[PDB]
Every structure is written in structure tokens, then in C-alpha cells.
Amino acid sequence: FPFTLSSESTLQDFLNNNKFFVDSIKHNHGNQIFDLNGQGQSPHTLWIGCSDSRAGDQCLATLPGEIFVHRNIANIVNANDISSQGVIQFAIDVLKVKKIIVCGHTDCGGIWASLSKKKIGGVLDLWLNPVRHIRAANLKLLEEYNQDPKLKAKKLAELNVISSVTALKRHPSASVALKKNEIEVWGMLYDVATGYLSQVEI
Amino acid sequence: NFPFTLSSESTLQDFLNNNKFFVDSIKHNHGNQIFDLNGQGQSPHTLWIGCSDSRAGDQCLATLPGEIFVHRNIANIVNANDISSQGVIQFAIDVLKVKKIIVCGHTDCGGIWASLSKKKIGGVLDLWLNPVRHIRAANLKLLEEYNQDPKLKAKKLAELNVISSVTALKRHPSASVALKKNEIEVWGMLYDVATGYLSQVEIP
Amino acid sequence: NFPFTLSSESTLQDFLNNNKFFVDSIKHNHGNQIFDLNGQGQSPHTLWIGCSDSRAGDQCLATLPGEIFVHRNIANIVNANDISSQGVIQFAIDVLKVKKIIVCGHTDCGGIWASLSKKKIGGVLDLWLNPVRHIRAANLKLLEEYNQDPKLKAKKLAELNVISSVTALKRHPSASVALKKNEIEVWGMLYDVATGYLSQVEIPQDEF
Amino acid sequence: NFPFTLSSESTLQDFLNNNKFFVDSIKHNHGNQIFDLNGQGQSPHTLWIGCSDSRAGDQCLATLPGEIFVHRNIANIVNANDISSQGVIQFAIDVLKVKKIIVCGHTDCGGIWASLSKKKIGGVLDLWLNPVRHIRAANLKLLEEYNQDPKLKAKKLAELNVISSVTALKRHPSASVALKKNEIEVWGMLYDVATGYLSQVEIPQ
Ligand SMILES: [Zn+2]
Ligand SMILES: [Zn+2]
Ligand SMILES: [Zn+2]
Ligand SMILES: [Zn+2]
């Protein structure tokens, strides 16, 4: 379409996009940024967000070596998910990030599925359980946005962000550094139709 | 406090200023066309599995929002016991019907280097990395026809790890059916953190 | 050696000798009927989830082969991202169509004791047991009401753990459906290691 | 009703009653001695890893409580990335110091039959069973030599699966150190569901 790449696009087409990424960085910064990249990483921020192609840490327009990223379906931080827990562990314990952003977004597939109770199948029903819990736990509140789907899904999306932030703060290395005031934590919402990022109230 | 767009000392406002740029930048080049398409759904053409590392993101493909479905974790490990990986893989193929999948490791991977050391890492990480530890053991001293240079051992390990993840990805139910119907293609790649260059890994 | 049927020093043939007795015993009491049924397929009426502990097995229910579908792991933890447990539950409900599910903890459970401590174990077990450490953390005050007797404290955590596993089990997509259709029944239980007796664990009423 | 002790329509009291029998039966033969030992701790000599199947089951060894540490899961898969199994093995070897580990497959195993097809099962089971589908693929020419009797096809696969599980078990760090110290024995077995009999599987060495 109006996108840089397509289904039909070739391997070389991909490598052309990548040669552009290098040329652009080099054009604005010389070799200095890859020289830094190539010695170590010292990112300032951990971003935890949905896997969704339209959400994504891109929205912050940072350079390589600024943001440590974890992305998964519906930006769920669960204590038993070893994928999340390693990333958080490593981010706080090794990289010493000073900010953590948990970012959800509008039109989230996990959020919408969790509202309409038809079993998705495979492993997805299990993966989404905590969201299905969050909806059940907040039924009255959600009910008050009943008269508009997109807003109910959005309220749920926000509740999910808050849920993930609490779980994040209860992480052992997080909880320590948080109370030593070494770290800062934010919930956010990404608006898919506008590209704007707003802060969730916590 | 950097040649980077943000530092540790930045503000919520500063952050939000970067995002205002992102939006203005997209609008400058494309008008509302993207955020209009985005706002009515996603139809990405590619799934990207790579490392969480702040240098080796999918950014290195310079795509716009709406093109690439992403998962990132420590050392780009794909395992069938991991409901996170498999959930993503499943959704991408069956629902989103992505036509390309990319597994990307990269040079200077902390997970890979740790997998090469003696020192127990601690917590959940040492367990997380066991799959890589197994790959080192499963590959001779093919790893160190190179113990003359640390960096090359790391790179070969990283590539073996990519190959590991790719094979696993291919044995996924959705993947094996898609690949047999020739309805999807699969790539393993390495990002050189020092150069910004992506390259292909040959998959056996 | 010595009250027990087999020992460390036992032999393969000794084990096979026990198995010979198991076969002869069932044929003595039921003739050939059971092994003929077994041989034609399984139709168990119950799923049992309990701890691996050698003292606490489903044999405490004195059933014959073909009755009880069994999963056993350390501290009878049922967690929604553990593919082992969730496969067992999906299969039992969907395919076997069990009518009863029992989640059964027990007293002197080592997973419980380990979780009451703060000392790290090692290997996988500190992470396996993490759900239990959480339950203990979320009931800290309730539990410290049993500082008078550590044994009763551990017994309480064993119960909370049962309650946690059951609740997770019921949130399984196959289970939640079967339940709301009243096609299945779910029991928390506790097994007293010292008496061989099985008690029912009171499970919270439906709250969401 | 059945020829089995309990039914789909059996009650809670009814279950408690079979448990009451269990207790009575054991004190009848052994006094309070088993439960006294039990009550103080556990010292099992054997770890059993086997299938969840209601017909299989470590009861085929006719042991008293306190002898055998048990793990059971679908098709008795011992996989290095499966933490349920890996915890059981660690604890058994490192803490309980079991002297024997037994991996037991069985005939008519539903996980085996499902791995013989490549029809998708759905939910989680395609993933769970993947390492067995692998085994099928890597032994295809062999398993097809059993085409005319599907049941002996499933038996061979169930034996291959046992060999694979035992191989993974022995690569467990606890196991490996124990194995090299001649501190433990590991056995593959198969359980014939139709006959109640247990046989040994020849494992490579
Ligand atoms: Zn989403
Ligand atoms: Zn890395
Ligand atoms: Zn126990
Ligand atoms: Zn079976």
C-alpha cells in the first residue's frame, strides 16, 4: 500500500530498507551512534507493550541504545511468565534502567477477544486469562461504558495496563529499586488512530 | 545528556515531545493515510522475533506502523513450552496471516555471552537461558575453533541460537501447516550492533 | 527393607514380582474382566491432581485401574501457563469427559515447607514454587496467626494452595464451560499423611 | 454402576468411604506402622515417571505409601524445557536420593495415537505432543514396517517415546552426576494395559 514493504517484497527489498536505516542514522550522526552501540548498551528505559504492528516503541522515535523492549500479546506482565520476568530482572538488575513504561493501546486484539467470550483456541485462551479476569473483576465499571463498545474496550485496555504495572511493581528487583527510589514507572496508552501516547492514571 | 534523543533524566513531557515528533513526522510524509489505516485495523505482512536488546530492535527495518508484528525477549529464544512465543506465532499465522517470519539475533547478545560463562547469573535468567546453554553443549568445540577470539565464538553461538529458534518456530502447528502449503516463508537473520547491518543466516 | 514391599536394594525381578502380584490380585478378585475392559479403552470418572509425594498418591482412594485420570507434580500446583497441567485438564474434560475433578494437597508437603522459608533452594524449584510463595505473601497475617505451631501454619498454607489451584483449574476454558453447564464437579481435598485420611477443603463461593 | 469401585454418579461420602477402606486395609496388614513412618517424613526408593492414563499408574507395582515418588503427565514425556518434570527429577535425585528412576510408557496410549496422526489436536496438546510427533518423523521408515497392525505401530512408538524420555532424563544435571557416580539406576519400561503386565524396554548404552 503506502507502507515501505509488502507481502510480495523480497529479501533484497528488506535489506534495502535496512541500508536506508543505516544511511539515515549515519547522515544525522556519523558513525558515532554505531560506535557507541558497538561497544555496549546503556538504555534508560524499559518498554513493555503489545505485539501489535501499529503500537510499538517506534512511537517514541528514539535511537538504537535508548529503550530495552519486551513486547507480547496484550502487554501482559504476569508473575508466572518467565519471559516478562527475565526482561524486567535484567533491565533493572543489569542495565539499571531508570524508567519503565507499560504501554497498552486502543484496538488491542487481546482486549477485544477478552470482552466477547468465544474461545480463541490454541494457547491464546490461557495466555489471555488474566485479562478475562480483569474484565470480570471490573464488570460494573465496564458496564458503565456499555453504551459504546470502543470505550468499553478502551477502559478495559487501561485496566490491563494498570494490572500489568502493579504486577511489575511487585517484581522483587523492581520492588527493591522502587522503594530505594532508583526507578520510575509509568502506565501509558497508545491511540492507534492518532499516533498519540497518553498517560494511565495509577 | 546524550547524542541520543532522551536520557535517564528526561521527563514525561520530554517523552511525550518525542512522540509528538513521531506523529508530525509521519503526517509530514504521508498525511493521515497511515493513522487512518491503523485506526481501522492492522494487516502486517511480517512477524519479527528478536532480542529485547535496545540496539537490535525491528527499527532496523525502517518500516512504518502497521507493517510488522513483533515479539522481543532475551536472546530471541523460541520454545514450545513458552506460551508467550507460541501465542504470538499462532496469532500471527492463523489470524494475521503474516507472509514472512524473521528471527533475529545479533552481535554482543548478553544472553549469548552469559551462556558462554561459568558465573551463575541468578534468578529467573539462568533458567530462561538454559535452552542456549544446551546449544553450546550440543555443538562440539565448533564453538571454539575460535577460542583464539571471544567475539567470533559469540557470533557463531548467536547464529546457532537463531537456527535453534527458527527450527522450533517451524515445528509449531500453525507454521508447519503454513510452510507445507507454501503460504509463508521463514528467515533467520543477524543484526551487527556495530554497523546497523542486517544479514541472513543459512538454515539447514 | 522393611515394612515396605520393596527397597533400595531391590532388583528388577523383585519389581516384576510385585507387578505379578498386582496382576494376580486383580484376577483373583475380578477375574479377567478388568484387564479386558482396560484393553478396550479408558473411561475414567475422575481427574486427580495432587503432589508427587510418595505417601499422598491417588491410591488413597482404593480404586481399580481405569477409574482415575492422574496428574501429579510438586505441591499440586495448577497454573494457567503450565502446559503440562493445562493439557491434562483439557484432555480430561474435553476428551475423557470426567465428571469429577479433585485437587488434593497434603500435610507435611515439602513444597509448602520450602515456601514458608525464605532460603533459596536452587535449580528449577525456586521458580516452580513461586506461585506458593505468592499465596503465602498474600496471606502473611493470617499465617502468622499460627506461629504458635509451625505444623498448623504449614497445614494452612497447604489448604490455601489447594484453594489457589482449584480456582485456577476452574478458570480453564474447558472447565468454566463444563461447570456453568453443571456437567462437572470440583473438589478441594487434603490428605493427612500421618493418618491416611482424606478431608474436604472448603472452597470459596463464587465471587465474580 | 460398574465393576469398578466408584461411578460417574458416586458421591463425596462414597469417595470418603473408599478412602476409609484404604486406611482399614493398611492397618489390618501392617498396624499403625506405615502411617507412623509416613507421618514423620518420606524416604521413597524409586521415582516413577509415567502417563496420566487411568489404566497405567504406579499401582501396577503394588507398593505401600512412602515407596515411590510419582510424576504423571500425558504420554510420559520427559522434556528438558518442561519445568514440571525437571523439578520432580531434581527433587527426587538431589533431596530424596532415590536409587531407581523408572520411566514407563504403555499400550493404547492416547498421546501416542494422536502423535501417529498429524491432524491437529487443538488447544495445548499439539504443542505438548510435539516432541512425540518428532519421534514419529525420525523413525518413519521403521514405524511403517508395522502398518498392517496399527496396535503394534503404537506400541513401537510408545517404546521409542520411552527411550527418548529416558535419554532426556539422563541429561538432567542431577541425573548425570548421579549416573556417573553409580549412585542411581534408570529403567525404561512399558505397561500392557490389556494384561496388567509390565516389561522392560531395552535402552541403548
Ligand atoms: Zn494489542
Ligand atoms: Zn541480546
Ligand atoms: Zn507435597
Ligand atoms: Zn497414555
Author numbering:
A (entry chain D): 27 to 228
B (entry chain C): 26 to 229
C (entry chain A): 26 to 233
D (entry chain B): 26 to 230
From the paper:
In the present work, the crystal structure of N-terminally truncated CA from the pathogenic yeast Candida albicans (Δ29_CaNce103p) was determined at 2.2 Å resolution. To obtain crystals, truncation of the 29 N-terminal amino acids was necessary. Δ29_CaNce103p forms a homotetramer organized as a dimer of dimers. CaNce103 is a complex of four identical subunits organized as a dimer of dimers, in which the dimerization and tetramerization surfaces are mutually perpendicular. The subunits in each dimer are interlocked by their N-terminal arms, consisting of two perpendicular helices stretched from the rest of the molecule over the neighboring subunit. The active site of Δ29_CaNce103p is formed by the catalytic Zn2+ coordinated by Sγ atom of Cys 106, Nε2 atom of His 160 and Sγ atom of Cys 163 located 2.3 Å from the acceptor atom. However, in the present structure, a molecule of β-mercaptoethanol originating from the crystallization buffer fills the fourth position. The contributing residues, most of which are hydrophobic (monomer providing zinc ion ligands: Ile 129, Gly 165; neighboring monomer: Phe 146, Leu 151), create a narrow tunnel, which serves as the only point of entry to the positively charged active site. The substrate tunnels have similar shapes and orientations, although the middle part of the Δ29_CaNce103p substrate tunnel is rather narrow compared to those of other fungal CAs. At the overall structural level, however, Δ29_CaNce103p is more closely related to CAS1, which also forms a tetramer. However, the conformation of this segment remains unclear because the first 54 amino acids of CaNce103p were not visible in the crystal structure.
